[PDB]
Design a protein around this ligand. Sequence first.
Ligand code: AGS
Ligand code: AGS
Lengths: 425, 69, 326, 373, 27
Amino acid sequence: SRFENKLKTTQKHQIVETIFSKVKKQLNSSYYLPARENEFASIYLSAYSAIESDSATTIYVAGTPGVGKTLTVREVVKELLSSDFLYVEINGLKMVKPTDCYETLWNKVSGERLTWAASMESLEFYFKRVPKTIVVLLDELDAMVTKSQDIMYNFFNWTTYENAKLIVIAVANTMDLPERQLGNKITSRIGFTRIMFTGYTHEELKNIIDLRLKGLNDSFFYVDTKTGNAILVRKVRLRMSADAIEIASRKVASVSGDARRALKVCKRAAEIAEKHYMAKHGYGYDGVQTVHITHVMKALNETLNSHVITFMTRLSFTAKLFIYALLNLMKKNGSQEQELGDIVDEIKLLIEVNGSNKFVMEIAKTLFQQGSDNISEQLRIISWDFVLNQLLDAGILFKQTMKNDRICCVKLNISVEEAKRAMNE
Amino acid sequence: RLSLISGIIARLMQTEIFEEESYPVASLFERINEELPEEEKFSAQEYLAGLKIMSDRNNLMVADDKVWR
Amino acid sequence: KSRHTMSMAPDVTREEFSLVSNFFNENFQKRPRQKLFEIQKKMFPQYWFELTQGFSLLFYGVGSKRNFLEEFAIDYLSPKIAYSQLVNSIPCLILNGYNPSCNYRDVFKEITDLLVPAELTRSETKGNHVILQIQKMIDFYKNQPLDIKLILVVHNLDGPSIRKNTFQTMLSFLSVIRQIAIVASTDHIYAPLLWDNMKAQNYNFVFHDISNFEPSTVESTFQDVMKMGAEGAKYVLQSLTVNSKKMYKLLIETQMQNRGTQRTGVELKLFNHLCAADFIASNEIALRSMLREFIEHKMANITKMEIIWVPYTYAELEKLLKTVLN
Amino acid sequence: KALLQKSSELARTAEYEQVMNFLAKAISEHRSDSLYITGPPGTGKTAQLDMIIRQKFQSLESVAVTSINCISLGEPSSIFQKIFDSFQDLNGPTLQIKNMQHLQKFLEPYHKKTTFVVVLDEMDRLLHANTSETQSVRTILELFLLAKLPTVSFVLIGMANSLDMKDRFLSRLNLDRGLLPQTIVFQPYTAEQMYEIVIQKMSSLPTIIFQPMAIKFAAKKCAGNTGDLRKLFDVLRGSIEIYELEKLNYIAKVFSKFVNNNSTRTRIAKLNIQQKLILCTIIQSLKLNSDATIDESFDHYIKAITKTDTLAPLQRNEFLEICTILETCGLVSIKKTKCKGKTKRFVDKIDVDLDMREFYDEMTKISILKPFL
Amino acid sequence: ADAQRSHYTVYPEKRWELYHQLHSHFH
Ligand SMILES: Nc1ncnc2c1ncn2[C@@H]1O[C@H](COP(=O)(O)OP(=O)(O)OP(O)(O)=S)[C@@H](O)[C@H]1O
Ligand SMILES: Nc1ncnc2c1ncn2[C@@H]1O[C@H](COP(=O)(O)OP(=O)(O)OP(O)(O)=S)[C@@H](O)[C@H]1O
């Protein structure tokens, strides 16, 4: 509103619009829908009746995140401005305290700021007195349910008044929410509309990608060979291999059916080809191009593959010495949770059960003193507080709090087999 | 008498051969004279009055006579 | 361990209990009760005379004393002392100790307003200043003309809130003042565990027996036993759908076909098929949803076959059979 | 075709006949009967009394009888403030609305000596408020005491969901005291009083509403678990737009959303044969009925796959993604449960909605999980 | 009637004189 005038600055020194820059502009998550096409009507025809008849209803939709329920209801009200209402985005998680939404409503009727106590008095005074038109979105309803349900009873008791000019639209995480958190007295007021949103399917996940790729798929750019700048000296084209787009769809529809996850894995795979193109020619920052299948093979795996295995083999020696002692106790006792003094008891013992091998002796010299035969005879090993602190904040280990530094228990936090498996290297 | 013949329809509503709470009129006749109890089937009005008593017991209904909801 | 238990008792409903209880407590031993009440009436001039000496009078004894204190404080003493000093009579401030909602702040806020606000004592109101504010009350009262202006009554001094220790010491400093007479009663058998020689120095208690074997009508109200669930879910079934009665009837039959424990219970699959047999349960979800309503009001249990069993006794379920289900 | 069904969605009840007998002294200006009106939920009971008082106020003599909703108080003061709002006056409000004895001074009227009855709406928020015998039962106790000597008495009409509240009353109060006795209940109307109101709420009648015996069919086969037939007409009003969208049909559409995956669409969730393997792997770890971590499951997943070599052992990171495929269909739920070593630390315990009876059918068709059982 | 409310207030010798000359003198 105000400060967007101050967020503008002047000197914009000719940023290089490369080949893959114009992809990510439309691969931004902003800018009729194919997948939830008919269900848009099922909201709207439920909404169009109450709007043009001055009533008060409730609409309940559910589903996993990434299915358009943030998007679709915005498209409902957007066309309605063409044809009497006040649009508010009452987000649940964007309220700091749960009562703070009450302030917004009384602010968004006349422009006044009181407490949440004094708002809902005049709100109740509004909802049963006004002679005769308010659209409200109660987003992310896991936030506003938590304390004692006294807030949630209000937001549907206002719907019961026949003289209440309000239209509520609830969007939740799960259909189960008025059956495993709310009471039945709320569950009578929620109704039984219950419009379910499923996931997306992999065919439609192809049909959502090309909507972003409408005017740019297999099109042509005008490029100077000196700076790498592209314009919608050569006239190059850039093509997108649809089969790699398909294998993006057949995974994301399989695991999650999430519309952000489908776009972003294409967005991550787009910039892999960006740096490899910049690697071969180096246009910096100041014949026919494509995106291979091998890009989305890596980037989809890049969502999965870890490093704690690679982290463990790149740790210190006494770190790998520590875990090897720790699995030795877990196969000695079978109790998966060993006392800290017994580990210090073991790393002493794991010295001399091995032979007089000078590597172990050059270890055993260093393991109790950093050379320096002057100062010696250390009880616990060198930096034993350090590696145990280093294994703690790494999340691999976990150690309960006790002022005794002997009988405080230690519990593993990652799978102990992969700890056994990474130890083998 | 009446408990046994409706009890067949219970496990035959446990299967999806009626596909819904809707069920056709020919679905009845292939579930009385086709199934096990012989000669207990009453007159053309009487077990048709017998299914009224089940409707009077509010467990199954009769509607859109080629089908019944 | 074959023990006879209170569950195996012929139980009594709400209106049946309290009415026949009211018959006994007003007609059992009526003649000797007022016959006691006339005997102890001659002690009333003796209490009046000792109470001029600022003695904290304490009444022990079996039975409730609540009726006796209110006759002795209100009607007898409080106008007798006003007539003997020479106009409204002496203000009586009772303290219902059997009422657990007594605090130290609220009753003392009454006290300083019952007592004289001759100075700005709200200036010393500041953060616990209660002992501070009463100390400024005490030393001023050491140099005043000796006359009672207030008599307070504390019923059931071993009560659930008055027996708290920060409240007890509060009353201790009140009793050393000569202007107020402290007539209280306790009922506990371990009531003299409450006071040391520090407090009784401030108290100078004396004792008298009153045993009229009263029923304690008001003092029974806050108290509860298992008379006051088998009786809890006895009322919810009286207001539900008509189908829930039938699906509980089919529940209660085969759960009492075999105390009502786990072993007499039924598996979920066959019970779904059984309540599918009488054209009642459509499937598992329609069964379970109107079975969660029996779960939400804790009217049935489940342990592991997948055994759902009713936690009421063998005798209770046939009572639930012939009365409310039928 | 819209305007006939645009108007579709919007003395009258056979329960109002009860309460005029229960208010038999309310037109003779005397103290009426003793009113504690309860009900199972959804039964119209909030608007039921609201129907009576609005028919009372539109009918009715000086006219001032007020009703306030006990939702956002948790405390018995401002109810006695809101009875003052029908006066439109000004006073010292705080002390007079706080103590039991302070309410008694408030009950001396001014203009023409019409008696006042209060209506306490939604009393169960204060019943099911803070701890019982400390504040809330005392609040219940203090309101129901009508021992006032003139006939100007604050007659209560309070309402509640769950019917435990009468046994919660003390034995003194249950000795025929106050608004106690007439525990007027409202059994949920099956179809025999609620549907006929829908008939009279079809005063403006379109030609094709639909076959009303199907509406009777709708009423009979909703009355298993229901209380609000206009709201269960609001599910007919959604299906009446289905016949507008296509230019108990919908209850049939809505139950198949809920019944399925256990019988049929379990294999829909596990098109991967390894997803069938990992689903049995969870249940084999459920022998140790513990906090079923994603690691202890991964422990039993490796130590079985080294014995039977059906596939190579996969990653833990793969094991993270595959169990989430089991998650989004609605089979297994994951929650961050409790372990209390250092802080409130969150390990993930799973729970399965399948039984071994609905397991054993779908695994005998595949003899590759038969080594694993 | 009111006894469940806590702390409600309400506003309802030839020999002995020879004691009186002795008692306070001692005190
Ligand atoms: N059918 C669609 N057509 C076009 N863009 C879409 C479609 N579905 C989702 N998107 C885009 O993907 C984004 C995903 O956001 P939404 O799915 O609307 O949010 P969501 O499903 O509510 O998840 P939440 O908000 O965390 S519960 C949208 O903001 C759009 O930018
Ligand atoms: N018999 C009826 N006559 C008129 N309107 C009715 C009737 N039954 C239900 N309604 C209407 O449908 C609504 C459904 O009742 P609900 O308000 O959801 O339940 P309730 O009124 O809150 O009672 P509760 O749940 O015990 S607080 C009522 O509020 C009325 O608007």
